[PDB]
Amino acid sequence: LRLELAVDKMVTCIAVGLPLLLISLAFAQEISIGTQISCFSPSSFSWRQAAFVDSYCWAAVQQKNSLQSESGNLPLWLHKFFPYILLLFAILLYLPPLFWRFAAAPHICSDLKFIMEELDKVYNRAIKAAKSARDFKYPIVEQYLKTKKNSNNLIIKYISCRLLTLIIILLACIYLGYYFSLSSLSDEFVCSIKSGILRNDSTVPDQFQCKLIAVGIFQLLSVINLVVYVLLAPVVVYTLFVPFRQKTDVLKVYEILPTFDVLHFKSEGYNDLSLYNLFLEENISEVKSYKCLKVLENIKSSGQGIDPMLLLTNL
Amino acid sequence: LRLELAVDKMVTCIAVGLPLLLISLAFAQEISIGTQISCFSPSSFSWRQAAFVDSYCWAAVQQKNSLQSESGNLPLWLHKFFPYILLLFAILLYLPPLFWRFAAAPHICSDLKFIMEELDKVYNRAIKAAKSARDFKYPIVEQYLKTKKNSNNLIIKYISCRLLTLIIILLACIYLGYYFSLSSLSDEFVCSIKSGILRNDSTVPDQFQCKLIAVGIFQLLSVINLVVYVLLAPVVVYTLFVPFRQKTDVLKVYEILPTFDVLHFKSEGYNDLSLYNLFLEENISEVKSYKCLKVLENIKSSGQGIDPMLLLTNL
Amino acid sequence: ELAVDKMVTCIAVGLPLLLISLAFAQEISIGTQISCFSPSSFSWRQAAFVDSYCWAAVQQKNSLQSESGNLPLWLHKFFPYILLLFAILLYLPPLFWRFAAAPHICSDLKFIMEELDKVYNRAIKAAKSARDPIVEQYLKTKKNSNNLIIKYISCRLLTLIIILLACIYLGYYFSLSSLSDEFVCSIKSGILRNDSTVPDQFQCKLIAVGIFQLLSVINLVVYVLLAPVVVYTLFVPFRQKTDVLKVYEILPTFDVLHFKSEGYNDLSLYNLFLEENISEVKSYKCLKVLENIKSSGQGIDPMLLLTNL
């Protein structure tokens, strides 16, 4: 009852923990030198006057009139808001898995548990009929899967959460590629504390050379995040192609039972049946009847004996 | 017994954790530079005199006589009390859930557990009667359903907590939209430490140019909170109109039981019955009898066999 | 603990604590709580001495001269501990209640619920055999002594008294003037008295006062909103409604008598606690199902009881 495919669990783990791990690294007790901005006030300035210049320019990356930067004010905005953008991406990437687990999870589980119980029951009834021969009959699970072939609401939830995950991953790739595509000189901006009563003041110099520290770390981490995300996006796209992944028809092994109709009827659709096929292919190893039937099916590759006889021997 | 609808749990989680997360972000070490205010005392001022000017003006954003600001004293008040406002909204948004958690639960959880037990019992009795055929009778829960429609005690509590949540969310949206609408130059105010014995003092200048730092971060976070809240408000509203959300009649699947009267009788009212319908639609997946009955109902879409026979096979 | 009482306790206790932590948190604070503006000639440590001396000197009335008086000065230092004192005093009655009051009402309520389940079982067994008042006297006794409830209304009355005293204190401090933090201070006792390098007086200002007043008005608003709730909760008889035992009157093994209303006696308190905890009683749930069905009046009470099983 995991209700989360291993590839989906790992995609979520990566896409969420990587921006968080990178945020935590960008401010390691060993990577931050100190403040995020330094402005180089004149030597005549006192300690507190220099602190004022630093804090003023930090707050002044927003006020476009005060600061003059060669690259523009937009790089300054992006440099100051550096860590917020990654936590936002982590949260947005965590949202679709949360929507999946909160509502979609429970619905998928009940049906799969019922299908496994019905398969075990049909196996028991088939071997009991075979045992009585050695001494109703309605394909209920087949009809249930035929019904699942119709409504795709159960799957559309899955491909929708995967599609939002892919969209957010692509938007994060775009943002990180832009941010890394930084000038790497745009962190140096000229700042002027000359609004208000300081405007015509003379002891204060006209402009200060400020630099936004710990930016290079942001870009080096953004390229790492972008690489991992462009490696992750094909995985999500493949996860999206849910019918293509439905392979090795799991119910085909049950077709050798008399109490089971000879019909797979599970393929070719953007419908909940393909999703159920994937989840059955995953959780079917827990089904003992499936295990024994697959043993007989593999033996049938040689073709030495016969299916009903072998089943009777297994008991 | 979660006793909280998934949409309500997520609305609470968002509306409460988002202001808390934003408070915690607004003072992340990388994000802040130092003090919340800086005042630029003259160069002749000692370190402690400049500290006095900073702290005095910080405390003087309240005393309207001391500070002269172009935007007014109200922006100064709003800038100083940025953090306090965020927590208060989180608490008020968490207050409704707390009342629901303790006051609301006895009325509903007990009733829902009783309804689920009665449904399992009627299912068992119906299959036992069917099994005896293959070899009292009072609709107590249905009588119970009528009470829900006539009783709004367990509902009016729900729509009241939801309505207070919506009202507080709208008040938070109004406050955040106002705060974000602040001048962004209103963080610079002129401050004069000239009350008391300093009034006619000469070494102290007439006025100081103070600037409130960490206000741009407050506005950037307030717009995020406002966006998330105006996205959340339709969800709460959507939520307020329960009569509309009561859909996919859950008891309709039980109408195929002989031991159960053929009557849904659950719709169209601002009464506790609609609330109970929502909570049943949520918690009904835990009911095994409901799961099996829904399996039979979905199979009935094809119409191959028959309802009582299918039930007998399931046993 | 009744839901309204639990929420009143939660508010009246956590609000002063949350408000202390608001102002209390280091990030919210600019720095020290007092700043005194020593002269420029003073060294760093001399200015620190002036600050700390005046901070400790808001008590010594001889040193400081303030226009409003020494009481406003003492009030500021008092407030961080005064809010915690109010939180503790407001937590005390709920603590006394759970420690003493619940044990007496808990045993009685558990016994009443067990007796109700037993009478229901016996009634359906008699009805089943046909198809084939100890609890009332106990409640009549509860109708007499109000000592069991007197504990409840006493803890509620102390809660109301402490809430009103907190409202008075918070309203008093909030009006103030705010010029008190601007009161002067003179470090001229002892050997510094006739010293000349030290100025006669310093202009000190109490840091983070405005935050205290803005939070005190919030606490006062919430408390004057909470006081009517306690007063309503104070009146136990009014809240006793939707007679819970009336649903049991349809049992043959149960006498036809509610006999639970109209008094400042422990019976009304027990009625409230029964109305709260009665949903746990399965027999009450089934009986209420039958009673709601009886609104339509289609069948009959004993038949549905027997049929319901």
Next chain:
Amino acid sequence: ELAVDKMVTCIAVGLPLLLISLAFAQEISIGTQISCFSPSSFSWRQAAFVDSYCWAAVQQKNSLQSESGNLPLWLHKFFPYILLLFAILLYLPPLFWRFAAAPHICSDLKFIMEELDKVYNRAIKAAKSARDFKYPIVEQYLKTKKNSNNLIIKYISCRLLTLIIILLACIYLGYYFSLSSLSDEFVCSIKSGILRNDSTVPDQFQCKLIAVGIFQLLSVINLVVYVLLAPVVVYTLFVPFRQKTDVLKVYEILPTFDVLHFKSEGYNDLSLYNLFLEENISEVKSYKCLKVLENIKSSGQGIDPMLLLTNL
């Protein structure tokens, strides 16, 4: 632990702890606990040395000269530790009695409740057989409890130590609370060792112990709460006075139970057991039903054995 004893412990222990935690509020403390006002010529580190030296020198009586004396200085510097000491000493008797005395009374009380339920069952069974051994074992057990008071002597001893420690704390807080309010200011001289004949260092420094006023304002609060708590302990100290509403009197209407209360008037373990029975007796179902019959008997309409048989 009786509710009044639990609340007395909670107050007497948590109040000094809460007051310690308040005395060091991140908003009531201006900074260091002492400030000494070195001369202007002194560097930052020299002034720090003067502060720390005088802080450590409130003990060395030769260095500091104070008008009130060295004892106020000691009390001003060791104010916290003393409150924690009082909290610990006040927590000790509840720890002691709970560890050993509790189980002794718990086993006996559980046995008494079981025996009462058994005698009730036997009485109604005899009455039921009439509608269709005999040894007062619990009465004899309580008669025995009436003898040795050692089981209760533990209780009144822990209560008496609690009262003694509360009174000692009241005395200390009243003494400490009633301060000169000038003591916080002491003259300190860093002139021992090689600094003795040094000339650049002044003869004496004016030090002040900051946040002492907070200590006194909190000590008066602690003293008020403690002198309000002491009458509660004294009342709780007197076990015999507390007992009332004879709980076993309701059982006297049973045939299988002898007609004898025999529980009153002594500084013996029987009175303590009476209190604990009065507390824990509501859990006893037989007691509940018997009290129902006893309250009905106030009207006197029917009869005790008939209503008991009808009780079932």
Next chain:
Amino acid sequence: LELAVDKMVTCIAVGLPLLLISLAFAQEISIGTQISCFSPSSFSWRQAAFVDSYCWAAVQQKNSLQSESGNLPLWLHKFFPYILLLFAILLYLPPLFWRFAAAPHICSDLKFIMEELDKVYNRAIKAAKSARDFKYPIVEQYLKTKKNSNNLIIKYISCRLLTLIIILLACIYLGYYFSLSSLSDEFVCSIKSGILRNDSTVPDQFQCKLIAVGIFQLLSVINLVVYVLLAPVVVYTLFVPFRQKTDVLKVYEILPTFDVLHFKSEGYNDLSLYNLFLEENISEVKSYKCLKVLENIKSSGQGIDPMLLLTNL
């Protein structure tokens, strides 16, 4: 679900870089900032702080700093802490298979094999008990089938091979750090871009030194030593066939209800992996325990096979 040698290889290869990161930045070994630049005496405190932070950020901008070794050694130190964590994460990723729900791929089949072995043991002793008073080798056929596809094991050798590749890449990277002279921290720095370019009060260049780099190299050599000790373990663990000896089944051949055939050896196929996992988890099987008791007794030959089987009951 994770072999003890694999669990310990993961624990080492992951926790060692993390422990070394945590050690490198311990208060007792860190003196303070990671860089110090020695501004002139005329510079104020904040001007010196600006020089330090500027040069720290300027190890990237190649135009500002002039170092004898080059800019690559400078960039290596700053990213060294990040690499330690990157290597830990990449080494944790393959074990991620164990973390993920891949247990059913191997354990569920194992659970079936153990149940079938207990069942065949019970049936054999019941037949022997009836003598004292179907018959299809299903598990043998299942293992014969496992002897076919090696896809189930290919997952295992693939995660082990990625672990080995990442360990070797980490060894290569760490080897490099130890090899470097690291005078790199002594590289000069010039705060003369922008308006400071033609400024005169600021000196032409500053002598900066990178703090905690000697600690980084001393820890990198430790990590490299542990990793080159760990790589042979992974290589041995890589060879699943060379890792299998004394198969558990050879003890079940003394049962009448069990065919006389081990048929489990010699292949890069899932059968060898299942043999390893059976050798590990077989001690939980009670029937295996009793059969091994009889097999060990058979070394002496004092007691008959079927007789001792029936005798044990």
Next chain:
Amino acid sequence: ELAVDKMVTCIAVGLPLLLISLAFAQEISIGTQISCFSPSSFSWRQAAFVDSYCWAAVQQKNSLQSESGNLPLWLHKFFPYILLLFAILLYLPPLFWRFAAAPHICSDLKFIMEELDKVYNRAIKAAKSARDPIVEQYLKTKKNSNNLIIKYISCRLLTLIIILLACIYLGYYFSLSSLSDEFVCSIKSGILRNDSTVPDQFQCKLIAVGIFQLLSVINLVVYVLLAPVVVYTLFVPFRQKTDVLKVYEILPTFDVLHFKSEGYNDLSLYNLFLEENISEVKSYKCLKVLENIKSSGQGIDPMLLLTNL
């Protein structure tokens, strides 16, 4: 994990960790780990540069000149981590023991206990009917291969080897002169080489090295007290005694044979683990009650066993 092994692990691992945490106590540590005494003319930041340069320069042998040598300087700075390395290496064998060998012995021991309870039940059932050796062969087999125990003595031997290496290192480190923490450092590489305002050499001293030596001698004392314990634990045969299965020999359904002694084989290890975990076995407890009684002769063994029920 045997109690002596658990305590040896706890000591050998937590002691270096506790000592690391003590060496850097806030009261204990004064500040930085190095101080260099720049001239008075040097600014604050120039002195900080000298400190940090010399800290990083304990490695570069050309810069610093120390009387003891550069190796003591390396050991000074690397001493804190070295203790964590010893803690980790000492934790490794117990960790290996938990996964590699503990389950192998756990399954076997649980099976032996179950078989002993079963044989006891069968013996008393046979005795009860009168009133109205699989485990031995398994242990005989264990007497063969010592591979199961070889894991145990191997983890113990690695623990002893690492403890002895730690003793050697700590005895060497404590044998430092305690003046080797004072080294002369010269910031004169690069453009500072021919600079004149900077003095030729600085007198630096390594902070918290006396604390390191005082803690290293404590660690060495505890480790040389622990090493004999490991050596004794190393000899499994010398430890086994009080033959635990001898109490079972009084059962008819159990063969009269202890057959557990005298070998560097897994049987002795299993004997130790049985002696430890056998108190959980109820049948063993009753047999020891009566097994001891049989020696006394007060009552006969089968009669008391039947009476045991």
